[model samples]
Target: GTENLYFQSNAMIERLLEIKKIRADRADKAVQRQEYRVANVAAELQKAERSVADYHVWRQEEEERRFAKAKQQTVLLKELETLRQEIALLREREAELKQRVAEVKVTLEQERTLLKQKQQEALQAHKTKEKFVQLQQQEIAEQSRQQQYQEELEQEEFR
Candidate 1:
């Protein structure tokens, strides 16, 4: 008979099987490591998305607050405008009263002195009203400009 070689019949076979089992175990561990890494990345992405959502909510709330403030400012400006118009009408009425007083003075009426005094008081009151109206208009314009600047700043923050 010829010589026959059977390596599995010796300790070599046992060593080979041990090495194969070790390789298989290492491959399984590598797979578990990859899965863990993927899971961790997914968790990080979810956390980032939550942060973005929170930022969006905060921005919306800030915008709403600004809008309310602007609306209030607009109403105040409207009231100021109405007051200024009323003052202008009062000035016209004072002019007409002065004309009537002048006519009465030409007739040399007994109450001409009283009418002159009354006209002087009305003129002073009109001057005070004009000054007040001018101040209010300036204040309203300044407030409106400030509100516009604030809104622009907010828009820039979002961009």
Candidate 2:
């Protein structure tokens, strides 16, 4: 009986030791899993933080680009307005030049007509002067012939 009791006691102690070892192993595995999960969570958090920082930087750059574009648009608008004004002024000047050209053409035509009229008047005056001179020359020749005949008659009477 004593031997049997000692054997039973020894078997029971061995079984308890086996159960303790299994529980310890299970606890170690759980600790390792928890550590892995913590590491993964930390890594994910860091990646998210980096993404946020990048987003902020991108947003800032976008704002700056927008501001620059707006400034450029303003300058372009001003230039467009100025160009429109210049075009208007140029068009007005062109119109004035066209008007002046028309006036000059009219004046030129009038002057040409006046010049032609003066030329015709000068031609008529020259013709009248030529006729008057010819008539005077003919009268002088007739008087000279009459003087010669009179002298001839006196000479015959004296003879």
Candidate 3:
């Protein structure tokens, strides 16, 4: 009976030890799972933080771009206004030039008419001078023939 009691006690101790080992192993596995979950959460948090920072930078850049575009638009609008004014001024100048050209054309035509009139007057004067010269030559020839006839009569009487 004493031997049997001792054997039973030993068997109970062995069973207890087996149960403790199983519990320890289960605890270790649970701890490992918790660590993996923590690591995953930390990685996700880091990605979220980076995304937030990038969003801020993007937003700032967008604002700057918008401001720059607005400034460019303002400058372009001013340039457009200036160009319109210049065009208007150029059109006025062109009109003035065209008016001057028309006046000059009228003046040129007047000068040409006056020059033609002067040429006609000179031609008439030349014709009158020619006629006077022809009449003087005819008178001189008649006087010379009368003088020759008188000399011929005087010579006959003396003979």
Candidate 4:
């Protein structure tokens, strides 16, 4: 009978250890997921910044080209009054192009900001999920430890 009790105690200890290990594994997984989420958010933020930078570079290049073209048109007008019609047509076309470019820039900025916000929200949610998992693991470990102790005490008294 004493041997059996000792065996039972050993088995219980092993079982408790296994449970603890499992919980630890779960906690590790949760932490990994949380880190992944943080990385994803950082990537999103980087992409947003890159997009803004790209738009600015494009606009600067376009502005320089537009200015050069306008200067050429101005010189042509001074040399030939008959070129007034062509210059006016070119100016109208350039205005339309500028309007379209402005619209695209605004759209890109909005999309970038929206992506950043979504990433922030997702990372926050991941953090909350990790905390809940940790709490659950801790509760299970504590409960099992208490139960095992109680059983050992009762067995000792019986002996």
For all candidates in order, the CA lDDT equals 0.53, 0.56, 0.55, 0.61
lDDT agreement of model 3 with the native: 0.55
Better of 2 and 4 by lDDT: 4
- The true-versus-predicted C-alpha distance at residue 69 of model 2, in Å, is 15
> Which stretch of 10 consecutive residues in model 4 shows the poorest summed lDDT?
77-86
Which residue pairs clash within candidate 2?
none
True lDDT of residue 131, candidate 1: 56
lDDT of 1 by residue, 28-75 (tens): 555555555555555655555555555556555655555566566766
Report RMSD for candidate 1.
46.5
Q: Which residue pairs in candidate 3 collide?
A: none
Worst 10 residues of 3 by lDDT: 2-11
TM-score of model 3 (CA atoms): 0.44
Each model's total of backbone clashes: 0, 0, 0, 0
lDDT value, candidate 2, whole model:
0.56
Ranking according to TM-score, highest score first: 2, 3, 4, 1
Better of 1 and 3 by lDDT: 3
Q: What TM-score goes with each of the models?
A: 0.35, 0.46, 0.44, 0.44
Best by lDDT: 4
- Clashes counted in candidate 1 amount to 0
